[PDB]
């Protein structure tokens, strides 16, 4: 078995190779359609049933388009829908929101719509805009020129929402406080006086209507205020609009510094980072009550807080995970977690729990007594788990047919170790607790009796409720659509099933692709964005319908294509998915890129690309030619490339994910090496003497653990933005997988590569560290403090900084440098002949 | 000519080598005696004339010793003085750690001491505590260690900058939270004089200090103090007295704030620093005075704080920096050396205490006090000089006793006239000023200027008198001679000289040739101590007795008296370099050092490592012992590298025109000279392989290392750059504005001098650039390195990077230095010297 050595190109030549092979990927890296919305025409003469609206990128900016859904289709041919443009057209906190949401594309990111009026409302650039289409005013046949919402506000306006109750009114966040503006009457009004804009963030820590760093980064909740969907009518012929909102106080939260992007300044931004073990923000609910007269003039605003403290009414709650209003607008719901994230609660909150904010004790005491004792929080649902709660967006409340009962669908891993849908009915008891006594409530005084718990789905697979996945209820046919892994962990698919008499699960998407679906609000259409290992992504429209004899049974017909596939890329040879039975008692899946132009008898250098943390699955049946293109390029340059989804990865169950609880970094490489050896025993072109490992973020963490724990196997490790020290990562993430540092002294020690710098190799040209200098998430100090201890230990390293980058690489020049450095580093210290001589 | 390749040792092996060769230098890295002071015994029957006191390091802390100077010696033998400990054994803050960076102090212990002659009172800081002992006053001389006496305090924070009052040795003063305090060491009365700073407030809110030198003055002007005691005390009719303290008050409200990484990396926090970058404002500065009334037994009756009658901007037109300050011997006037922004216009200015009026906010009482001071009471510019190059600040400034009321007489040094720094006796007549304050107008550009009655040149020629880094002048007023250090005999050797300041001409050398010297004269001008060395012989401290022939006091003769510190004797594993010189096409002889590779093979050619500084204020090449400091240059020679060092133009100890060569033009002229001298060595010695040359330096050295890779990528294969200034706009005022001027008047100079701007001009080949930097560097902020990497990333150029996260501008932590040396040797091996390095292309 003679070793294959990779051709030794210069730095300039490799750049030209990377340039050339990336030259025809301009069209490939531009956003496919999203935020789909179906709206009916209601024109019995016209040829179109629906108009669909969607954000898309036609190198362009991201904007609203529309397309026409026909009443009928010529089934001989394949219809491709034409994209009509709907429209005709960063700060610090805008940049950070884009980092927390991981938004890469510039342009309009989202939009509210009001059905009754046809009003779009969207932020675009600095300004907020609004146009009507599809309501009373009908349907434009050409681009619309949008209307700028005017403002007296000096600073940037974030998080704009239409009022569902009255589309003339909108709300937004300005300088950490809630404002409202009327787009007809031009009336602006500040609803909250919490944050003084002029004061320092060290002095003034309170905000209102905003989600703090932890909730944005680890719970994907970006908004922190919620319009009440209905308006209560006054005797005056006016109305009351309500807004529930979170109010954070970050006074006791640690203040870290992060380098400012303006390197010119040599300055540092202040952040509130609650590191693991430290205080989270002190939270509470508030409600602004807004009285409007019979033609949109604000009579009065009354800001109102909870009758008792949050710590009393919601015992043991740390994070407000999700919140909103029930469809009727009667109750305010909230999904709530404890500190350890092992106990979830869904709680209804009557508006009568809130009372006027009054610093005077006489009036405050009279208001506390004026609210009845019967008015109480209602914990309609609770669950626990030995592993942890995975927050998701699935939660549907039904119409309230009885005063004393509520009915809803929620999802959970806590019964079976697999996320499934459950229809639940909770009795709303008058609480045992009485506020009159001047005592504090018992820990199960607000808990509702559970009348019904029908499991809608069940099995060795999961329903998806994150990254856009959710459910869609059809209340007429009493069905529910959802995405799942039932057919395979390697393929996401759309399914439907009755929530009444839950029988079999009818699959709707065709096997052999993975699907990202979305159902028309009128439950008569769905759009699938799908791909597979060989075929690029493509977005297609499918019409739903039922047999006359049984409306439960749904079937689908292809209607039209929204986005056509690009077709197979000339250079790109995709990888083969493989699986092997582990000694751990689990099937682990892998991907293998065989070297291109495979020589008989020879063995090749091997790059293990890895993420291996939670909330991620690299190995599945989607097209990897866009995102992991350079793994194919590595194959063309002679490297074997391996990717293995170890234990802890998602889409395999909660027990699979919980494998590394308290044990992070300790088990993941054992699976990687097992997968790497399964291939070596079954393919003799894998040179195990020359194996490299590389990854970003958690992948970078495991790259260090690989070279630390198993230097015998891995020759080189290239670690990108790694946590080298778990004590400087946030509460929300770390405490979920690792607990409090006092209750896991050994897990934290063993999981922190900075505490174990003595175990790194004393040969050079093995460790390479990459990091964004401006990283606010995996703060650079992870790399800087590891380097401090590597220097104490007398160990060698190589360092590459990206001074204009935060956690992700956004600037193309930076990404070009990275890809070029990585390719050259592997050539020089793994692949080439010079690399072998070097030892 | 076949190429020699260096033994390709492993990382673990090279650490062993560097560890083994470091091992037997425990004694070598220890501080020799310094801050010497002679005190007479005045004992007819006693065998000793003087007792010397000095700071020294007997891996010990720096502490006070004394030795006994005999009345006579046996001239057959060589007397070694015994080191007697003055002190008995004892029972870092942020501001200390910065001061040590500003003063460049490596060693631990007692840094300095004050001494009151009349009482024997020492005063010295050691740790946070401030201590005193008595020895050599009326009380007498101890034969045993003394117990250090802690000055007790009610101050919470570190007391910095203690100074003994020369008028009363019971009173001391110190800075505490940027304000001046005084404490009596007998009565224990402590007191706060200035109420300017609020310790509990953030520096962003409150940046007014009192009695402290701001960042630029400490870093660039080597003034580490902002208050000065008046040396005599005015007596009151009460029976007690007035003491006075001149002090600089600063206001850094308008100065830009940058953020430097905190050393505690765990916090992930940064500290706020007032860094006046080139272009931006320096602090608003002024003189103030604290008038301290004491009664008959040492109680403070009262304290009056006083300010200038008119603002500093009016009274001292043009003045940015207060460079030096203090009082005249009698205490009649306070003096001050004052520069303009461009640092091309120096002024010496006498300031009467009667210029200061009590501080008042009430406009009624304030206006009455302005009228009560006479119009004759005025600033007095006693000396002014200008220059097309710049003004190098120095400590040489001696005022004589004042006989005629209207006149004042002094010695001062200057490069401005001759082009080289020489001494000048000057007499100045003190006019009542033309400007009159009662008028209400403002003074014109030179209404305070004094008639120059005399300007005798005590020295002259193509060589400089030294007045920096501990060099100064001693003045025998009886015999009317002035002692000084200089380069008259050679630029490569410093020597002690003496000359008359009445009838100058002949300049008698006192130190022996063939060595460079660091000398120090007794206050009674009858002894001198020289710390001397040369390229071959380690440094050595000896005591010499001065004397004259009966007939002629001018004729000064020395005689060896005793050894204070004996030479360690040549280190067995050390070969010193050869000094060389060559005629440059610039019209200047440039010198250099040359370490040949050990066991030199005939016929084979060797890889070459040019080591560099090359900026102003320093000379690397001279006849001093380079065996301790530049030891690893020899370690490179032993591995089979040539090592070259050349002092290019703009260097040091060669006059102001030589230094001025790179005015407005930094980066541009230096690498020419380095390459010329390197090409000179190649044309003469054929063991120098020019196809494998590397450059390396720290700070300005690293700056030029980058420039050399940038400008001359044909000559230099690799370049290792340590803590470089990549971008001149980010460096401070006092330094940049001096050599490069304001950036508005010199865009092209800055552009060409800033490597970050010219990132495109770096090579596209990897394994050539290596950047090193202290991550906590407060002077050459890490941003220089980070922003350079920004544009190297943009340009798609490769680099190697090494960070030392515990270090500021110096490398203090031993583990950090060990790693730097290991990485440097291994980088040079794998990318320049070794065989595998050759195959790598
Ligand atoms: N707050 C978490 C969050 C998290 O762990 N996440 C999984 C990764 N995920 C992105 C992703 C990255 C790489 C990949 F290959 C696949 C997905 C992603 C997903 C969707 C999307 F649209 C854009 C990006 C975001 C959420 C964190 O940042 N660290 C970074 C880090 C680094 C070291 C150790 C622990 C952690 C923990
Ligand atoms: N503020 C100045 C100050 C200055 O220019 N100085 C000359 C150097 N000098 C030290 C020195 C360093 C290296 C060497 F080889 C010899 C001496 C020294 C002197 C006495 C001592 F005890 C210990 C060290 C201190 C004063 C500056 O720091 N930079 C750093 C820097 C870096 C790049 C470009 C310009 C400058 C300008
Ligand atoms: Na997020
Ligand atoms: Na200094």
Residue numbers in the entry:
A (entry chain B): 48 to 105, 108 to 138, 148 to 897
B (entry chain C): 48 to 105, 108 to 140, 148 to 897
Sentences reproduced from the published study:
Here we present the development and application of the Aerosol-Generator (AeGe), a new gentle soaking device that complements the humidity control and uses ultrasonic vibration to generate aerosols of ligands to soak reservoir-free protein crystals. Two protein model systems confirm the advantages of using the AeGe method in challenging complex formation scenarios.
We tested the AeGe on dipeptidyl peptidase (DPP8) crystals using two ligands which evaded complex formation by regular soaking methods. 1G244 is a model for a water-insoluble mol­ecule and the EIL peptide is a model for a low-affinity binder: neither forms complexes with DPP8 using classical soaking. Regardless of the low nM binding affinity of 1G244 for DPP8/9, the low solubility of the compound in aqueous solution might explain the lack of complex formation with DPP8. A pre-filled capillary with 10 mM 1G244 in 100% DMSO was positioned near the active surface of the AeGe. As the humidity decreased, both ligand and DMSO were concentrated in the crystal. The crystallographic structure of the AeGe-soaked DPP8–1G244 crystals was determined at 3.2 Å. We identified positive electron density in the active site corresponding to 1G244 [Fig. 7(a)]. The 1G244 molecule is fully visible. Importantly, the atoms of the fluoro­benzhydryl substituent occupy S2, but also overlap with S1′ and S2′.
